[PDB]
Symmetry: C3
Subunit: 413 residues, 3 copies
C-alpha cells in the first residue's frame, strides 16, 4: 500500500546527532550554527547550519473594490400631465438612485393651483446617493496559506525549501517539521484597508453578499467595471393637500454603512501588515504580531538507518484533461486530470492544480496501475491563469483557463 504523502523520517534515536525543539513567533526568523561531532569518528566534527525565514501569509483574494461613503437625498418632482418615462429627472444623473412613481393620481387636493388634472400625469419621487467618497480598499479572502523558507546544511548536504506551516522538509540526514497554531484569519473574512496597506486593516465577518441594503457593511461598492449600489428599503408616501405640490416622504434608513461602522468602530478587530505585496488575485504579507507562535523540530542523523518515509518505486505521468468552474472563487474550479501509474499496483498520492507561479488546491488520489481520472478543486487565480495538473514539481504542459466568477447583486424593487 504505497504512498509518498508521509513527509518525514524513521529514526534510530541512539544514532541521532542533534535535536532542536522550540517555539518561534511567525514574524521571527532564526539562525543556528553548530559544529557537531562526526558519528563515524569521535575525534572529528562537521558543520551544521539552520536558517528559517519569517512566516509569510498568502491570501488568494477577490478585489471587491472600494467602499464608498455617501449622503442620502430625497427629491419630489411633479408633472400635471404625461407619464414618468417622458421626463428626465435631477436624480437620474446620480451614481445610485431608486424612483417611486405615482402616475395617474392627480385627483383633487393633491395638486398645486396650476394643475386641474384628475387621474393623470406623474408624481415621481427619487431617493439618491451623492457625495460619493472612497473610504477604503476591500478584499475577500478566498484561501489561506502560511509558509517559511527553511535552509539546512550538514557538512556537504545543503538544501533550501519553502515549507507549509504543518509540513516537514526532509534531506539525507536532516528533518525539519513545522507545527502551526490557530489562524487570526479565515476564508471568507473581508479585509478593509482605510489607508495604505502598511497601516493595517479591519476584519469583518458580516460584509454584505446576497442582500446589500444601504446601512450595511459594504453597502456601496465601486469596482472598475462600475458602481454596485445597495437597495434602499423603506416605504414612500405622498403628503397631499393644502393646494400644494405633493411632498414625498421616506421612512427607511438615512445613514450610510461607513458612518454606522465608524460610530461603533471599536467593536471590530484590527490587524497589521509588514512587507505587503499585492498581485492580480493575491495579497502576501508578514504579520508583525509576535503572539502567534509555531513549533519547530529539527533532528540530525548522519546514518544509513535514517529513512525518508516518502520513498516509493511508484512512477506517475499527468495530462490536464478538462476544466469547469471559475477563477477567483471560494467555490472554485474543477480540474480533471488523467494520471498514469506505473511500477506499482496501487499508489496514494497528492495531485495539485497549478499555474506557473502557485498551486491552488490538491486532491488525495487513490491510483491503480494504468490510467486514472482524478478531479481537483482549485481556489484562486485570475482571468489569464492557465491551470495544469501537477505532482511534485512536474506539471502537464497543457494549461486551461477558467470562467469568470459570478459575484453579482440582484436589486429587485
Amino acid at each position: 500500500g504505497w504512498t509518498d504523502t508521509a513527509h518525514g523520517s524513521g529514526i534510530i534515536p541512539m544514532k541521532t546527532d542533534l535535536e532542536l525543539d522550540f517555539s518561534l513567533p511567525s514574524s521571527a526568523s532564526y539562525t543556528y550554527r553548530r559544529q557537531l561531532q562526526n558519528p563515524a569518528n569521535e575525534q572529528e566534527k562537521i558543520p551544521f547550519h539552520l536558517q528559517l525565514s519569517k512566516q509569510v501569509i498568502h491570501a488568494e483574494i477577490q478585489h471587491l473594490g472600494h467602499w464608498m461613503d455617501a449622503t442620502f437625498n430625497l427629491k419630489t418632482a411633479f408633472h400635471c400631465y404625461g407619464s414618468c418615462e417622458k421626463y428626465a429627472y435631477p436624480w437620474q444623473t446620480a451614481g445610485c438612485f431608486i424612483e417611486k412613481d405615482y402616475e395617474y393620481e392627480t385627483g383633487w387636493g393633491c395638486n398645486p393651483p396650476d394643475c386641474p388634472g384628475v387621474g393623470t400625469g406623474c408624481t415621481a419621487c427619487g431617493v439618491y446617493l451623492d457625495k460619493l467618497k472612497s473610504v477604503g480598499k476591500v478584499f475577500k479572502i478566498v484561501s489561506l496559506r502560511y509558509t517559511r523558507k527553511v535552509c539546512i546544511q550538514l557538512g556537504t548536504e545543503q538544501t533550501c525549501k519553502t515549507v507549509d506551516s504543518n509540513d516537514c522538509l526532509i534531506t539525507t540526514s536532516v528533518k525539519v517539521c513545522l507545527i502551526g497554531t490557530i489562524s487570526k484569519f479565515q476564508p471568507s473574512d473581508t479585509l478593509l484597508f482605510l489607508g495604505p496597506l502598511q497601516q493595517g486593516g479591519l476584519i469583518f465577518k458580516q460584509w454584505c453578499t446576497t442582500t446589500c441594503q444601504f446601512g450595511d457593511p459594504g453597502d456601496i461598492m465601486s469596482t472598475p467595471t462600475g458602481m454596485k449600489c445597495p437597495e434602499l428599503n423603506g416605504s414612500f408616501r405622498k403628503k397631499c393637500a393644502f393646494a400644494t405640490t405633493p411632498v414625498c416622504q421616506f421612512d427607511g434608513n438615512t445613514i450610510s454603512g461607513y458612518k454606522r461602522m465608524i460610530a461603533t468602530k471599536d467593536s471590530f478587530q484590527s490587524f497589521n501588515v509588514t512587507e505587503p505585496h499585492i498581485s492580480t488575485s493575491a495579497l502576501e504579507w508578514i504579520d508583525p504580531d509576535s503572539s502567534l507562535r509555531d513549533h519547530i523540530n529539527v533532528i540530525v542523523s548522519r546514518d544509513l538507518s535514517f529513512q525518508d518515509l516518502s520513498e516509493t518505486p511508484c512512477q506517475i505521468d499527468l495530462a490536464t484533461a478538462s476544466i469547469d468552474g471559475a477563477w477567483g472563487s471560494g467555490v472554485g474550479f474543477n480540474l480533471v486530470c488523467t494520471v498514469s501509474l506505473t511500477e506499482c499496483s496501487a499508489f496514494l498520492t497528492s495531485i495539485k492544480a497549478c499555474d506557473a507561479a502557485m498551486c491552488y488546491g490538491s486532491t488525495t488520489a487513490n491510483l491503480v496501475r494504468g490510467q486514472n481520472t482524478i478531479h481537483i478543486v482549485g481556489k484562486g487565480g485570475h482571468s489569464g491563469s492557465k491551470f495544469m495538473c501537477c505532482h511534485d514539481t512536474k506539471c502537464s504542459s497543457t494549461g486551461l483557463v477558467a470562467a469568470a466568477p459570478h459575484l453579482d447583486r440582484v436589486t429587485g424593487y
Copy 2:
C-alpha cells in the same frame, strides 16, 4: 494527586528502538513495516508494523430540511360587503402567504361601479409564494470530531484503536500521538448540498435563525413536519380611484434567497466529500482535500522503563442519575452522574455521556473518595437515544432519553 487523563508515556531516550515523525494529509492512510533490532539481544530482530487509516470527520447535525426556491405573487380581492374571515381566497391554498386586510374602507372613489358601500366590506390583499422547488439538503453542525484508526504491532504486541486528532494511543512498548491542524468546519456552520452528497456542498456562516425574511439564506425551509415560511417584510398600499376595483401594491423584496445566492455564488466556500455516511443525527465523511495535514509521532521502546502515564490505582463506578435538556442541540443536554471513587483519596478523570454507539461530550471530574455528583453537557443524538454515564468503556446500564430541541420560528406580522 492521581489522574488517568495524561495519554502518553515517560521514556529513557537511550532505551528507545525507533522513532517515526512526519506530516500526513488527513485524506491519506499510511503503512510501515520494519524489522527492528532486539534491544535484549543485538544478533536478533523483531517485526514492527504501523497502520493509520484516513481521518474521518464526524459531525453531529440538525436536519434543517430542504431549501426551497419560490416565485413571489401579489393578488387583490374585493367584496363590497362582509368581513374578510367570511371569504375563502385564492392565496389561502398556497404553501406560504401573508394577507393584509382593509375592512370597512369603502368610502367613495375606492370602489368599482357595482359597489355603493361606504365604510364596509373587505379589500383583502395577499402576497404568496408558489412554484416551490427543492434546491438542496441543509444540515447545521452541532459538533465535530476527527478520528483515525491506528494499528500497532511490535512482535507479539498488537492493538488497533480509534484515536482523536489530538490524542495518543499507548501500548506496552509503543506510543502513537496525533497533533491536529485547523478545521475547515466549525460548530454552527450550515452545509448546503445542491445535489448528491458526493458532489460536495457550500458552507454558510449566515443561515437564518431568529428572523427569517424572504431573500435570506434559508428563508423557505421544508421539513417532513411541514413548511417553514419566511416573513415577508415590506409595506402594503391600495391605489384607489378612477372608479375601479382597488389595486394593491407591495414595496418589499421580490427575489428569493436561492436566486440571490446563485447570482453571487462565487462569494461562498465549497467543500467536497468521499465515502459519505448519513445517520439520524450525524454525517460522516473523508475530505479528499490533501492540503490539510496532521502531525504523527511514533516511538518504540521495548523496555521496562517505558511508563504508561495513565496508570493509577484509582477505581470508579458510575450510575446515571438524571437528565434535562435536549437532543440534537448545540446547547445540548445535561446528564447527572453519581460517581463512586475507591482506592484513592482524590482522582481527576474524564466522565462521558454516551449512547450505544458514540459519546456526545465529556467533563473533567475532580473526585474525592466516596460518592460524587458530576454534570455533563452532551451535544447530539436523536429522539430515541438513551444516554449513559461512562468512564473508559464502562457505562452505567441506566440510559435516559432527552427532550426534543426547540428550533421554531416565530412569525409576528
Copy 3:
C-alpha cells in the same frame, strides 16, 4: 543575526535522561515524580518533579451590559390644533420609543365630531417598549489567551512559570513545550449569560453592531451609562374616516430579540465555566469540557551540551514615547516605544505593551544598534490602565492612559 525569540533547546539525544510526551485535557492538571539515574554517575540518582496546572482562558472583554426583553406597544394621540412639540405624550416617559407625526393633516373624514380643523394640529403616533426585563449579562471578546502554570524540579534546579499554549519553558537542564489545539472561542464572539457565570452561557456570532433593529440579538441593551434602544423599522399608517379619531397602524416587527432567540434556542452553542473571575476588562475561567486536549513534551538533559536557544549578548533599554487609540477595543491602542540596542549590530526581539498586571499585545522588533522607534498594537485594558513598553519583565516606568472606545449606535429615523 541574533534573536531571543526561539523558546526551547538544542540537545544531543544520547545525553538525555528523560522524555515525557502525552496529550492532556485543558481542564486537567498533572503531577509527575521520578528518581532519575545521575548521568555523571550510574550508581546515583536525582529527583525529577513536574507539575502542570489546568489551562486558564483569559478573555479581554467589553461589558456590553444587560440584554433586555420587552413588550411592543402602539398608541394614537390626537389634537385638533397645535403642533406635536407643544404636547407631552404617554409614550415619552418610556425607555425606548419612536414617534411619527402627521401635523396639518386634519382635512375632512379624518376627524372626530369635536374637531372642525382643516390642515392643522397633530396626529402623533408612538411605538414604544415597556415591561423591560433584564435576561442576561453580555460580553464581547476582545482577545484570548490560554495559559498553564508549569513547575519543574530536577534535583537542585526548581522553577515555576506561566506558559502560553504554544510556548515553551526552558531551565538549565529541562524544557517543557505546550502545543495547543483549536479554540472553542474566537475574537468578536459575544457571550450571553442568562444566570450566574457558573451556569454557563451561549455563544453568538451575529450580535447586533452597526444596525440594531428590534428583533435582533442584542437589540435592547442596558448599560450603566443608560439604555441603548434599537431602531424599529416598519411603516406607519393612519386609517381615517367613519367620523372618528385617527387610528395608527404599524406593519413592522412586534416580537423582541430575546423571545425570537428562545423559540429557536437549540440552534446556538452553549459553553460552561468553572472558577470564573471577572475584572474591569477581563473574564478568566477553566472550561470543564475534557474533549479539548493540548500536547505536552518534557525533556531532561543534565549536560553541558544542553543549549538555551534564547541566549544572546544583546542588551535592550526601553522608554514609552507616546500613545493613541483606545482601551477595551478589538481595534485597540497604538503604543510607541523608544528601544536602545547595545552589544549587538542587529537584534530581532519581542516588545510588549503592558500595564501592572498583564500584557495586551506584542510586536516583533527588527532592531539595529542605537535608538529604534517601535509601534505596538495593544488590545484590552480599562479607563485607568497605564500601558508601558516592556521586554522580558523589564518595563519602562512611563505608563500612558488610552482614550475611551467608540461603541455608539446611531439611530437615524
